[PDB]
Write an enzyme that holds these catalytic residues in place. Structure first.
Site, mmCIF file in Angstrom:
data_model
loop_
_atom_site.group_PDB
_atom_site.id
_atom_site.type_symbol
_atom_site.label_atom_id
_atom_site.label_comp_id
_atom_site.label_asym_id
_atom_site.label_seq_id
_atom_site.Cartn_x
_atom_site.Cartn_y
_atom_site.Cartn_z
ATOM 1 N N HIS A 83 -28.043 -21.357 48.213
ATOM 2 C CA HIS A 83 -27.958 -22.548 49.069
ATOM 3 C C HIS A 83 -28.814 -22.413 50.341
ATOM 4 O O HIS A 83 -28.326 -22.557 51.466
ATOM 5 C CB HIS A 83 -26.500 -22.910 49.382
ATOM 6 C CG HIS A 83 -25.751 -23.384 48.170
ATOM 7 N ND1 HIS A 83 -24.833 -22.594 47.521
ATOM 8 C CD2 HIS A 83 -25.866 -24.511 47.428
ATOM 9 C CE1 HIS A 83 -24.359 -23.244 46.467
ATOM 10 N NE2 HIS A 83 -24.983 -24.395 46.373
ATOM 11 N N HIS A 87 -33.593 -24.409 47.543
ATOM 12 C CA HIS A 87 -32.705 -25.280 46.771
ATOM 13 C C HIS A 87 -32.771 -26.723 47.195
ATOM 14 O O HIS A 87 -32.857 -27.649 46.369
ATOM 15 C CB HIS A 87 -31.232 -24.741 46.814
ATOM 16 C CG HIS A 87 -30.242 -25.680 46.204
ATOM 17 N ND1 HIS A 87 -30.291 -26.036 44.869
ATOM 18 C CD2 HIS A 87 -29.221 -26.397 46.748
ATOM 19 C CE1 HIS A 87 -29.315 -26.894 44.607
ATOM 20 N NE2 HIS A 87 -28.629 -27.118 45.723
ATOM 21 N N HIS A 123 -28.660 -32.334 51.663
ATOM 22 C CA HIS A 123 -27.364 -32.315 50.970
ATOM 23 C C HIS A 123 -26.585 -30.974 51.042
ATOM 24 O O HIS A 123 -25.380 -30.960 50.774
ATOM 25 C CB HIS A 123 -27.494 -32.783 49.526
ATOM 26 C CG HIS A 123 -27.834 -31.680 48.572
ATOM 27 N ND1 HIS A 123 -29.113 -31.188 48.437
ATOM 28 C CD2 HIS A 123 -27.061 -30.955 47.735
ATOM 29 C CE1 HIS A 123 -29.117 -30.215 47.536
ATOM 30 N NE2 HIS A 123 -27.881 -30.038 47.118
ATOM 31 N N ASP A 124 -27.278 -29.872 51.349
ATOM 32 C CA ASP A 124 -26.580 -28.551 51.464
ATOM 33 C C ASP A 124 -26.902 -27.899 52.837
ATOM 34 O O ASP A 124 -26.763 -26.687 52.999
ATOM 35 C CB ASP A 124 -27.005 -27.586 50.347
ATOM 36 C CG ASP A 124 -26.134 -27.690 49.078
ATOM 37 O OD1 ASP A 124 -24.966 -28.096 49.180
ATOM 38 O OD2 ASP A 124 -26.630 -27.304 47.999
ATOM 39 N N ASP A 241 -29.013 -32.021 41.621
ATOM 40 C CA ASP A 241 -28.297 -30.863 42.155
ATOM 41 C C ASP A 241 -27.981 -29.910 40.993
ATOM 42 O O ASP A 241 -28.032 -28.698 41.145
ATOM 43 C CB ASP A 241 -27.037 -31.316 42.889
ATOM 44 C CG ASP A 241 -26.454 -30.254 43.788
ATOM 45 O OD1 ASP A 241 -27.191 -29.361 44.214
ATOM 46 O OD2 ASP A 241 -25.253 -30.314 44.054
ATOM 47 N N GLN A 292 -23.090 -19.073 32.529
ATOM 48 C CA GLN A 292 -24.094 -20.124 32.271
ATOM 49 C C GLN A 292 -23.815 -20.961 31.023
ATOM 50 O O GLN A 292 -23.816 -22.175 31.069
ATOM 51 C CB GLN A 292 -25.537 -19.570 32.248
ATOM 52 C CG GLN A 292 -26.048 -19.091 33.616
ATOM 53 C CD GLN A 292 -25.854 -20.155 34.701
ATOM 54 O OE1 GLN A 292 -26.275 -21.313 34.547
ATOM 55 N NE2 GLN A 292 -25.149 -19.785 35.765
ATOM 56 N N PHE A 295 -20.855 -23.078 31.915
ATOM 57 C CA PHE A 295 -21.320 -24.101 32.856
ATOM 58 C C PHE A 295 -22.105 -25.209 32.169
ATOM 59 O O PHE A 295 -21.895 -26.398 32.437
ATOM 60 C CB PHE A 295 -22.148 -23.471 33.993
ATOM 61 C CG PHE A 295 -22.360 -24.407 35.165
ATOM 62 C CD1 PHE A 295 -21.268 -25.026 35.792
ATOM 63 C CD2 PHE A 295 -23.646 -24.692 35.625
ATOM 64 C CE1 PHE A 295 -21.449 -25.921 36.867
ATOM 65 C CE2 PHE A 295 -23.838 -25.582 36.706
ATOM 66 C CZ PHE A 295 -22.726 -26.190 37.328
HETATM 67 C C1 20A Z 1 -28.132 -21.691 38.293
HETATM 68 C C2 20A Z 1 -27.488 -22.904 37.613
HETATM 69 N N1 20A Z 1 -26.404 -23.475 38.466
HETATM 70 N N2 20A Z 1 -26.590 -24.465 39.399
HETATM 71 C C3 20A Z 1 -25.378 -24.700 39.988
HETATM 72 C C4 20A Z 1 -24.336 -23.867 39.411
HETATM 73 C C5 20A Z 1 -22.979 -23.698 39.638
HETATM 74 N N3 20A Z 1 -22.245 -24.393 40.525
HETATM 75 C C6 20A Z 1 -22.687 -25.224 41.659
HETATM 76 C C7 20A Z 1 -21.863 -24.902 42.928
HETATM 77 C C8 20A Z 1 -22.306 -25.832 44.069
HETATM 78 O O1 20A Z 1 -22.116 -27.161 43.630
HETATM 79 C C9 20A Z 1 -22.956 -27.616 42.575
HETATM 80 C C10 20A Z 1 -22.674 -26.720 41.348
HETATM 81 C C11 20A Z 1 -22.372 -22.741 38.811
HETATM 82 C C12 20A Z 1 -20.921 -22.484 38.812
HETATM 83 O O2 20A Z 1 -20.211 -23.349 39.337
HETATM 84 N N4 20A Z 1 -20.375 -21.456 38.135
HETATM 85 C C13 20A Z 1 -18.941 -21.273 37.993
HETATM 86 C C14 20A Z 1 -18.501 -22.129 36.818
HETATM 87 C C15 20A Z 1 -17.827 -23.330 36.963
HETATM 88 C C16 20A Z 1 -17.472 -24.106 35.858
HETATM 89 C C17 20A Z 1 -17.809 -23.666 34.642
HETATM 90 C C18 20A Z 1 -18.468 -22.527 34.415
HETATM 91 C C19 20A Z 1 -18.842 -21.746 35.516
HETATM 92 C C20 20A Z 1 -23.097 -22.015 37.888
HETATM 93 N N5 20A Z 1 -24.416 -22.186 37.708
HETATM 94 C C21 20A Z 1 -25.062 -23.096 38.456
HETATM 95 MG MG MG Z 2 -23.532 -28.640 47.892
HETATM 96 ZN ZN ZN Z 3 -26.900 -28.334 46.129
#
Ligand code: 20A
Ligand code: MG
Ligand code: ZN
Ligand code: ARS
Ligand code: ARS
Ligand code: ARS
Length: 336
Positions: A83, A87, A123-124, A241, A292, A295
């Site tokens: 962040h 980003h 936004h961040d 995002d 990942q 996610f």
């Molecule tokens: C590099 C790719 N990327 N981009 C964002 C993000 C991410 N969470 C963000 C946290 C901030 O708010 C937007 C999503 C998370 C992340 O939230 N990981 C924890 C998770 C939550 C739910 C399900 C599985 C895992 C993981 N990878 C992310």
């Molecule tokens: Mg944010």
């Molecule tokens: Zn963001």
């Protein structure tokens, strides 16, 4: 027109070379940062605004723009692994691409376009590199200020708008009172929609809108009221995002490594404070690769599949890449 932020003459051309990909999903923001003396947000925003003639349309002084953007970028923490301003630059450039998708051609006003890119940029801002729940649980100053509700997202908005209060930084000085009021409403709405706690409801409402979408003769979505336009915009910035897994694998892997450095540092803080460890921030047990896949499966694919559905067939290659990248991480899990 500023061409560099450093002392490297070679960088001027290298930077301009990267910026040839400004309107493409395949732009490499890491390279932009490296050729701009770590000013990816300032430079990409200057590029986007010039590309869209927004400085001309809104009578924004180049000098005021640069001072504001430099100072906004300075309020991103360079010691936060994910962040940080790179980003923000990425989400802004990604929003710039999504705004030009064929299905939304001519749909948005210039003020709406301005709002969306500004939202992405801010936004961040001033993100401390820990989650809303960590802030709430530690009775942090931010959580006490914001009564535990969209704590970071309210803060990002407050900083972004507070920075406009100084004359030398007021990029919206030449908007009318009504324009400023509408833009502020739109940006607040868009930034608050980036709180993941809102994602399930945002997605449900989006799916709902996709069901009753009216794609005109000429192939353009008909979004005829503000309520409809701001709903697409909030989902657009949300999609931006959450765009990392939809980028080339080379980029996606770098973004993952960063978010994990940030998440695992939060986990270390929780341990350090005798707090209960958030499972996915626990470096001793959490699988980067499973996280990942999960996610994507649970959050990114449902959203992007729904976006793609909305802008058919504009997003098909994005959907394909996401699915490829998902498969790559899965194949990186040693078990079936
Ligand atoms: C590099 C790719 N990327 N981009 C964002 C993000 C991410 N969470 C963000 C946290 C901030 O708010 C937007 C999503 C998370 C992340 O939230 N990981 C924890 C998770 C939550 C739910 C399900 C599985 C895992 C993981 N990878 C992310
Ligand atoms: Mg944010
Ligand atoms: Zn963001
Ligand atoms: As630049
Ligand atoms: As200022
Ligand atoms: As976590």
């Amino acid at each position: 027109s500023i061409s560099r932020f450093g002392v490297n003459t070679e960088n001027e051309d290298h930077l301009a070379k990267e910026l040839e990909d400004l309107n493409k999903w395949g732009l490499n923001i890491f390279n932009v940062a490296g050729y701009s003396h770590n000013r990816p947000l300032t430079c990409i925003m200057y590029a986007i605004f010039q590309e869209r003639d927004l400085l001309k349309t809104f009578r924004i002084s180049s000098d005021t723009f640069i001072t504001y953007m430099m100072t906004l970028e300075d309020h991103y923490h360079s010691d936060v692994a994910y962040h940080n301003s790179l980003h923000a630059a990425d989400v802004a450039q990604s929003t710039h691409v999504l705004l030009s998708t064929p299905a939304l051609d001519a749909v948005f006003t210039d003020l709406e376009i301005l709002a969306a890119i500004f939202a992405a940029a801010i936004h961040d801002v001033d993100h401390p590199g820990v989650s809303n729940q960590f802030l709430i649980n530690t009775n942090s100053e931010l959580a006490l200020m914001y009564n535990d509700e969209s704590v970071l997202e309210n803060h990002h908005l407050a900083v972004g708008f507070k920075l406009l209060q100084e004359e030398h930084c007021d990029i919206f000085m030449n908007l009318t009172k009504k324009q400023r009021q509408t833009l502020r409403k739109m940006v607040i709405d868009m930034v608050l929609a980036t709180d993941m706690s809102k994602h399930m409801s945002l997605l449900a409402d989006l799916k709902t809108m996709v069901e009753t979408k009216k794609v005109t003769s000429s192939g353009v979505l008909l979004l005829d009221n503000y309520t409809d336009r701001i709903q697409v915009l909030r989902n657009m910035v949300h999609c931006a995002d959450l765009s990392n897994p939809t980028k080339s694998l080379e980029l996606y892997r770098q973004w993952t490594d960063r978010i994990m450095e940030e998440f695992f540092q939060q986990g270390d803080k929780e341990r350090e404070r005798g707090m209960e460890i958030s499972p996915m921030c626990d470096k001793h047990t959490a699988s980067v690769e499973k996280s990942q896949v999960g996610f994507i499966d649970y959050i990114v694919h449902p959203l992007w599949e729904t976006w793609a559905d909305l802008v058919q067939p504009d997003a098909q290659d994005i959907l394909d890449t996401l699915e490829d990248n998902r498969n790559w991480y899965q194949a990186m899990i040693p078990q079936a």
